[PDB]
Amino acid sequence: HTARLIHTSDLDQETRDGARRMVIEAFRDFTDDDWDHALGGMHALISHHGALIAHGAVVQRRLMYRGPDGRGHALRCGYVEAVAVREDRRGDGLGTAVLDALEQVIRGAYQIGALSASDIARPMYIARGWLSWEGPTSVLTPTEGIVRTPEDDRSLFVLPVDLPDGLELDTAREITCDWRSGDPW
Amino acid sequence: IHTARLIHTSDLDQETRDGARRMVIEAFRDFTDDFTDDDWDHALGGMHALISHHGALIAHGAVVQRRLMYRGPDGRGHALRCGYVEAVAVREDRRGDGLGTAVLDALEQVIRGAYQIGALSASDIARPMYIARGWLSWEGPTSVLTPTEGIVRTPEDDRSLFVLPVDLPDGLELDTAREITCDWRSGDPW
Ligand SMILES: CC(C)(COP(=O)(O)OP(=O)(O)OC[C@H]1O[C@@H](n2cnc3c(N)ncnc32)[C@H](O)[C@@H]1OP(=O)(O)O)[C@@H](O)C(=O)NCCC(=O)NCCS
Ligand SMILES: CC(C)(COP(=O)(O)OP(=O)(O)OC[C@H]1O[C@@H](n2cnc3c(N)ncnc32)[C@H](O)[C@@H]1OP(=O)(O)O)[C@@H](O)C(=O)NCCC(=O)NCCS
Ligand SMILES: CN[C@@H]1[C@@H](O)[C@@H](O[C@@H]2[C@@H](O)[C@H](O[C@H]3OC(CN)=CC[C@H]3N)[C@@H](N)C[C@H]2N)OC[C@]1(C)O
Ligand SMILES: CN[C@@H]1[C@@H](O)[C@@H](O[C@@H]2[C@@H](O)[C@H](O[C@H]3OC(CN)=CC[C@H]3N)[C@@H](N)C[C@H]2N)OC[C@]1(C)O
C-alpha cells in the first residue's frame, strides 16, 4: 500500500468530490468547513479500481507558541486534516500509508506537524511518535485576541521536526492556532 | 519557450533549495541583502515554480498558503484561504524574455486550482506586470493580526498589495478601498 501525494491544484474536481464523499462517509460530524480546511496543501490518496479507499491532507498554518522567556514563535505548521479509510478496508495499513506520505511532507517542508485527533485515531498517532499536547489550546481571533478552545484540549498532537535553534516545546504551555471559520483545530 | 516545473518544498533536495535561495538573493541585489533569510523562509511550505537551463536555475517563484482577514461592507468577517506569492525572480542576464511570465503562469495555475484568493506585495518595479496579468491593486490600509496587540497597521506595505480573487464565497463584495489584514509571521508580514 503506497499513497500518491498531489497538491489540491493538481487534483481533478471529480477526484476531489470522490475524496470528499469517501471522507464524509468514513466519519458517519464531518462538515463543509472540515472539507474546506483540507484544501490548499498536499493530499495523500489510495484508490482501488477507481474507488478512493484512503485520504489525508496536510495544509500550511501558523501555530503560535510563547516560551517561558516570553519570546513569541509563529511556527510554519503542516496541519493534518480529513484523514480517513473506507470502513471495509480498515485495519490493513492504509492509515499508516496515508500518514507515511503526509509525514514525508511535514519533515520536508515544515517546522512542526500538528493535528486534532478523533478518538479512533489516537492510538495510531501515539504509536507513530506524535507528542500529546496537555497544555491549554486557544485560537488567535481577529476581534477578541486569543480565545480559549476548551473543546479542543486533550485532542492535540504535534510532531516537532525542524524547530528554530534552541527552541524546545513545553507541552504543558498554551498553544494557539491561526484564525479560520468552523472548528479552529 | 521554457515551461516552469511545479515542485512542493518537501520534494526539493537541500542542494536545490540552497541554489534557489542564492539565485533569488542575487536577483534582488549594500552588505545588507534586500532579500533576507526571513524572506526566503516565507517562500517555504508550498509550491515552487522552477525554470532550469543547462545546469543553471534561471527563474523561481513560490505560492504558500496563508489566511487573509477581510471584513465586508455588511460588517461580516472572512478568513480567506490565500495563495500568497513569494520569491519571484529571474537571473539578471535572462530578464525580459518571458521567464517571469512563465513562473507566474505556473503559480497562477496553483492559485486558481486551490485557493479563494491570490495575494502578493510587489516591488514598485513590478506593478505594471501584475496589472497586465489582471491582479487588482489594493488601495485601503494594510494590517497584521498580531498575537499580543490586535490588528496592527503595516503602513510600509500600503499601496504594495495586489489580489487575484479566484473563488470568493457566494455574496462576498471585495472592495479594495477597505482594510485588509494578513496572518502573523516573523519578519515582513506582507
Ligand atoms: C483512523 C483511521 C483512518 C485508521 O485507519 P486504519 O486502516 O484503521 O489504520 P491502519 O490499519 O493503517 O493502522 C494505523 C496504525 O495504528 C495501529 N493501531 C490501530 N489501532 C491501534 C490500537 N488500538 N493500539 C495501537 N496501535 C493501533 C496499527 O497497528 C497501525 O500501525 P502499524 O501499521 O504500525 O501496525 C480509520 O479508523 C478511519 O478512517 N476512521 C474514521 C475517520 C476518522 O475518525 N479519522 C480521523 C483521522 S485523525
Ligand atoms: C520582475 C521579474 C520577475 C520579471 O521577469 P522577467 O522575466 O524579467 O519578465 P518577462 O520577460 O516575463 O516580462 C513580464 C512583464 O514584466 C515586465 N518587465 C519587467 N522587467 C522586464 C525586463 N527586464 N524586460 C522586459 N519586460 C520586463 C514587462 O512589463 C513584461 O510584460 P510584457 O511581456 O507584456 O511586456 C524580474 O525582472 C526580476 O527578477 N526582477 C526582480 C524583482 C522581483 O523579483 N519581483 C518579484 C515580484 S514583486
Ligand atoms: C472532546 N475531546 C475530543 C473531541 O472534541 C473530538 O476532537 C475533535 C477532532 O476529532 C476534530 O478533528 C477530527 O474530526 C473531524 C471531523 N469533525 C475532522 C478532522 C479530524 N482530525 C477537530 N477538528 C476538533 C476536535 N475537537 O474528538 C477527539 C476528542 C479527544 O474526543
Ligand atoms: C512603502 N513602499 C513599498 C516598499 O516598501 C516595497 O514593498 C515591499 C515589497 O517589495 C516586499 O516584497 C518583495 O520584496 C522582497 C524582498 N524584501 C521579497 C518578495 C517581493 N515580493 C514585501 N515583502 C514588503 C513590502 N513593504 O516596494 C513597494 C513599495 C510600494 O515601494
Residue numbers in the entry:
A (entry chain B): 16 to 43, 54 to 210
B (entry chain A): 15 to 43, 50 to 210
The authors write:
Sisomicin is structurally similar to gentamicin but has a unique unsaturated diamino sugar at the ring I position. In the sisomicin-CoA-AAC(2′)-Id complex structure, the overall interaction mode of sisomicin is identical to that of gentamicin, except for an additional hydrogen bond formed between the main chain carbonyl group of Asp54 and the second amino group on ring I of sisomicin. However, three ring-containing aminoglycosides (4,6-disubstituted aminoglycosides: gentamicin and sisomicin) bind toward the β8–β9 loop region and make several interactions with this loop, whereas four ring-containing aminoglycosides (4,5-disubstituted aminoglycosides: neomycin and paromomycin) bind toward the α1–α2 loop region and make several interactions with it. In our activity assay data, AAC(2′)-Id showed a stronger binding affinity and more catalytic efficiency to three ring-containing aminoglycosides (gentamicin and sisomicin) than four ring-containing aminoglycosides (neomycin and paromomycin). It is thought that three ring-containing-aminoglycosides form additional hydrophobic interactions with the β8–β9 loop as well as the β5–α4 loop. Comparison analysis between gentamicin and sisomicin complex structures indicated that interaction between gentamicin and AAC(2′)-Id is stronger than that between AAC(2′)-Id and sisomicin. Unlike sisomicin, gentamicin contains methyl groups connected to the 6′ and amine group in ring I. The methyl group of 6′ forms a hydrophobic interaction with F42 and F55, and the other methyl group connected to the amine group interacts with the D59 backbone and probably influence the shift of the 45–53 loop region toward gentamicin and cover the active site. Consistent with this observation, the turnover rate of AAC(2′)-Id for gentamicin is slower than that for sisomicin. Our biochemical analysis revealed that AAC(2′)-Id can bind to various aminoglycoside antibiotic substrates, with a strong preference for sisomicin.
